[model samples]
Target: STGSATTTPIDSLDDAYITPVQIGTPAQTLNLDFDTGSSDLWVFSSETTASEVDGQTIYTPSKSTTAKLLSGATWSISYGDGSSSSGDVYTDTVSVGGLTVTGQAVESAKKVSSSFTEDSTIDGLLGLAFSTLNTVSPTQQKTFFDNAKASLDSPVFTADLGYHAPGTYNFGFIDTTAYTGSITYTAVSTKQGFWEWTSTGYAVGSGTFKSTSIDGIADTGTTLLYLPATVVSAYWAQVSGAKSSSSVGGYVFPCSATLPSFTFGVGSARIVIPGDYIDFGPISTGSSSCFGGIQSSAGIGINIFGDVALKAAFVVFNGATTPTLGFASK
Candidate 1:
């Protein structure tokens, strides 16, 4: 009825989380970044140009007897941060933690951005966003979640991110033991093909909650928490030595400064993110200045509740007809 897979942070800073996925016949296991911000299960594959492949483990679809190319089907996608990939599409058997989906669109990348090529830990990305965001040409494809929904006990999946440890991603059912108290849910809009929802309000440390609703997307693909400039400035202002630094990009402050906890609301529930999590990491080795995990979304246009916000709580992306998102603390 459900499946579970552990997600491991690639580094100490928890830059990205990767999960093992089985694809094709006989199961070619590859480490993939599970992203809720986009829709395209693309991977470094045999089709990737040798120069762009780097150290990634490629998916050799030719070896997967179950693999079948969708004639003339191609796909290309780019992210807000500018990284992009494009390739042909093939329907193949894919699985994560023993939960299998037949005829899943397995995109084989022909080219990839330098950022991806430089990241040796990831071989691909498993997109969980709505199928409408899928970039395949001629015909867009359904996401793994979308295809597996009909067979699942409940159309739901959960993302549990960790600050400096490993967590689990469960499909079809919620693991009650994984969180504390009750889950606070909000309406999710699929109009943008994202896990889009509104947050009730926010507070800086123990400050009074500012009762202003904020619209944002829950994005596992992104590393930082992006909010409106007003919210970002208000939070950063509380920390000594914290300022927007163009050289290092975004806001940075003395690593030794005491950082206050950040709290955001879902309905009447409050989720608090510890100060340590906001001190993402040093910009350079032995550097005294550290980067802030929460940045401004004024530039990008879409507010994002990424790993920074995610690590503070367990999130449930319910694929129910109403499409609501659940947030619970541990």
Candidate 2:
């Protein structure tokens, strides 16, 4: 009927959260990063080159009696961060939390970029975005949520991502106990294969809120919050020792700097990100320099409300007609 799962942060990286997922008949378990930015369920498999395997787990389709190849079907995907993978397709039993789907399209990676190969803990990615964005060729595939939604009592899910802590992802229902205050709802534009929305305005620290409309997507896979170059410049100008460091990448400041808070407006709701969270630890070990979690979204085309921003609030990904995003303080 409904499903729920716990998401744990990876080594305090504040990069992404991973959850357990089972694929095939005897159930091959893998810890996968649940991403809202893309729409394909792919995994490291036996088909992958040995050199790229690293310490990650691989899916052995031959061991599953229920696995069936999708003939000549194939899939390939590239992320905004430049990570990519390509593979063949297979249909199998896929389960997450308490929900299970039969004949779910599973992409088996044959080639992966260094970004994926270097990350030893993550075995693959589970996409939760709209099904239209799926990368499978010949016939597009539906995501695990899309396949299970029709059987749910209410087609909704909640992402309760926390900072340096464990959080829960609730499916087919909402848990009021996880958040406080009334949830503010905003219409989302899904035309771009993302949960994109426009913010009413923003502010730096205790400054007056400026009415600069910003178009951005709520992406669970992205590590840092991204805004316009001018917006990023304005925010860093308030920081005493902050500077745009080409060598350190993005804006960097002294680890001891007293950073100011940042806020984004959703309708009448003002979500404020604390200053401490913006200081994304040290850029490198033994260095007193730290990178700002907020960076310029210049070349990325659209701004991204990544983990740095999402962790500050409880988000509801509503799948009803005219999909809406509901936000409440955690």
Candidate 3:
């Protein structure tokens, strides 16, 4: 069945967007982070150790008659930020909006890293990335989107993540009203199990658009926009008091610094991120220094077009024969 769901910002932090998801027989609803970077539909569960749970809600399989253990199967995942989770597997009814996927694999987290345990709001991660990225063992499992795609009118979904505001995730159909202007399409390379694409070029502020191709992934789970070191350094150079701070991490500038706009090229189209969006708030309480949202992706291999970048434009994750991405001004 075709459907759509609203994604709301959890807090003013703009860290992630939460979507409602129903799992198990009687439908245990949970707010999950729709992560496009990694693939694994895992959640805090009754099996999670007491001390590791913190204040997060847990999904109890015993409460649902439809939950069935995936014999001898286990799943584990780790994030780039060092956060990790490991758990056993269970097959149950999983639904998003009005769409339902029966016998969907759901990982029940028994262990979680400190980063996850501290974030009490996010119950789990609903991976929207390709199935190849799934962490299930014995046999790889398909994502909620993958399982529901064949039944959908179109095998596609759109991510309309907003900046400190409400957005939506539409499935099977594109809501034309959600965006303005023509949707510029680009070819996606899923070789790395991500929505990876090569940008035609990029520019800092209103400067000349340098034709420097950069390969990166569109990650909804990430908070900052990460780019090449050279590119990040160029953008910081324009700021009056920007400099790399060892203790503060990455580059920091005066809170009142007049930052430049960051622009990315998608084929013939350009998506410009406002200067203020790059100023990722204060470095610490009572500190005049502010950490930049756009940082270096030096050791990360591929750059990341995180929420700071994605929220600047309306994004379309097309799952056609050769998966593609479409972007437009919001």
> Which numbered prediction scores highest in TM-score against the true structure?
1
Q: Model 2 RMSD to the real structure?
A: 1.1
The TM-score, computed over Cα atoms with residue i paired to residue i, of candidate 2 is 0.97
Candidate 1 error regions (>4 Å): none
Deviation in Å, model 2, residue 234 alpha carbon: 2.0
In every candidate, how many clashes are there? 0, 0, 0
Task: Estimate, for each residue in 1-330, the C-alpha lDDT of model 2 and write its tens digit.
Answer: 788889888777667888888999799998899898889999999999889999998899999999999998999999988899999999999888878889999999999999999998899999988999999999999998888888877898788888888898888998989888889999899998899988888999999999878999988989899999998999999998899998877999888899899999988888889988798888889889988999999988999999888888899989887898988887
> For candidate 3, lDDT tens digit of each residue in 1-330?
577889988787687788999999798998999999988999999999889988887899999999999999999999998899999999999988888999999999999999889998899999999999999999999998889889999988988888778898888988899888889999999999999998998999989999978999999999899999999999999999999887877999999888999999999999999987787778888889989999999888889999999999889999888899999988
CA lDDT, candidate 3, residue 327? 91
TM-score of 3: 0.98
Best by lDDT: 1
lDDT of 2 at 52: 93
TM-score against native, each model:
0.99, 0.97, 0.98
The 10-residue segment of model 1 with minimum total lDDT is 275-284
CA RMSD (A), model 1: 0.8
As for candidate 1, its clashing pairs are none
Q: Per TM-score, what order, best first?
A: 1, 3, 2
